[PDB]
């Protein structure tokens, strides 16, 4: 699709559902998260989703998270068909601001194919247990989980600007 | 063109010039960094930039800045026709890259490019006095548009991917 039908109604809503992207489609997703400077990426689908759900599950329990948390955290990897797990290895600002603009340019990526894609970066996002799950070093860090599969079903400017007038 | 293309093979605008974004195409990009705490936008041009231009240098003065450093201070807004200031409220600093990325897509997707530059003058007392910056505010950052004067490129994520499973 052309770009500027990319400044669609952007909708996004949750249930994302099969299709999952695969082949080029998500490699093109991942290519794009790549290209915004001015990582290591892990696939979790199909039977990889049972272990991902053990392993948040484990880091929920040994956080000492409520039943509630603990539950969610089994459950989260199954709302959708696909997961991409977004580690990496310069200020700390410089790191949190371009991890943004590439998981934008990976939603955007999915969303031009068709599909779409859910961020989500919790505090078991820093679990000993995750972290080991993912092989995170002393200086490695997960920043977040991309969820991704088929989507299933006016912004107002104005108040936030100002001109500089002189 | 192509949104693949667009975010695969960007190919960075180098220098942008007249025209730069007006109206609602100005509105448009706004509007996407609205999209994925309430931002600020200060809208930078013609006159302004040379205002804009006194308070950099100003904050390179206060600063100690060496004369390079001041010249490069006061030579900043005319890199591009207009300067958008984004402004914070106090997933981290992540939105802030996410709003960006957005308003720069924003920006290609109708012939213009995006430059994004901070720098330690964001941090600045004189340049934060500027945009009126109160203890809860933060100036992230400028966004320069205009026209690109300025390519293929495809990375492989490959050797950076594994399989969970």
Same mark, same amino acid.
């Given at each position: 699709?052309?770009?500027?039908?990319?400044?669609?109604?952007?909708?996004?809503?949750?249930?994302?559902?099969?299709?999952?992207?695969?082949?080029?489609?998500?490699?093109?997703?991942?290519?794009?998260?790549?290209?915004?400077?001015?990582?290591?990426?892990?696939?979790?689908?199909?039977?990889?989703?049972?272990?991902?759900?053990?392993?948040?599950?484990?880091?929920? @329990?040994?956080? *000492?998270?409520?039943? =509630?948390?603990?539950? =969610?955290?089994?459950?989260?990897?199954?709302?959708?068909?696909?997961?991409?797990?977004?580690?990496? =290895?310069?200020?700390?600002?410089?790191?949190?601001?371009?991890? $943004?603009?590439?998981?934008?340019?990976?939603?955007?990526?999915?969303?031009?194919?068709?599909? $779409?894609? @859910?961020?989500?970066?919790?505090?078991?996002?820093?679990?000993?247990?995750?972290?080991?799950?993912? *092989?995170?070093?002393?200086?490695? =860090?997960?920043?977040? /989980?991309?969820?991704?599969?088929?989507?299933?079903?006016?912004?107002?400017?104005?108040? /936030?600007?100002?001109?500089?007038?002189?």
């Amino acid at each position: 699709m052309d770009a500027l039908e990319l400044l669609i109604n952007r909708r996004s809503a949750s249930r994302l559902a099969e299709p999952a992207p695969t082949g080029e489609q998500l490699q093109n997703i991942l290519r794009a998260g790549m290209r915004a400077p001015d990582w290591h990426f892990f696939v979790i689908e199909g039977e990889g989703r049972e272990r991902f759900s053990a392993v948040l599950e484990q880091g929920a @329990i040994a956080a *000492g998270s409520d039943d =509630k948390a603990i539950d =969610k955290a089994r459950n989260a990897p199954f709302r959708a068909p696909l997961i991409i797990t977004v580690v990496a =290895k310069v200020p700390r600002w410089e790191q949190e601001m371009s991890a $943004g603009c590439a998981v934008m340019a990976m939603q955007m990526a999915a969303v031009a194919q068709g599909f $779409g894609g @859910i961020w989500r970066s919790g505090a078991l996002t820093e679990s000993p247990v995750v972290r080991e799950a993912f *092989g995170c070093r002393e200086q490695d =860090k997960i920043v977040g /989980f991309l969820y991704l599969g088929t989507p299933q079903l006016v912004p107002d400017p104005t108040p /936030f600007v100002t001109y500089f007038h002189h």
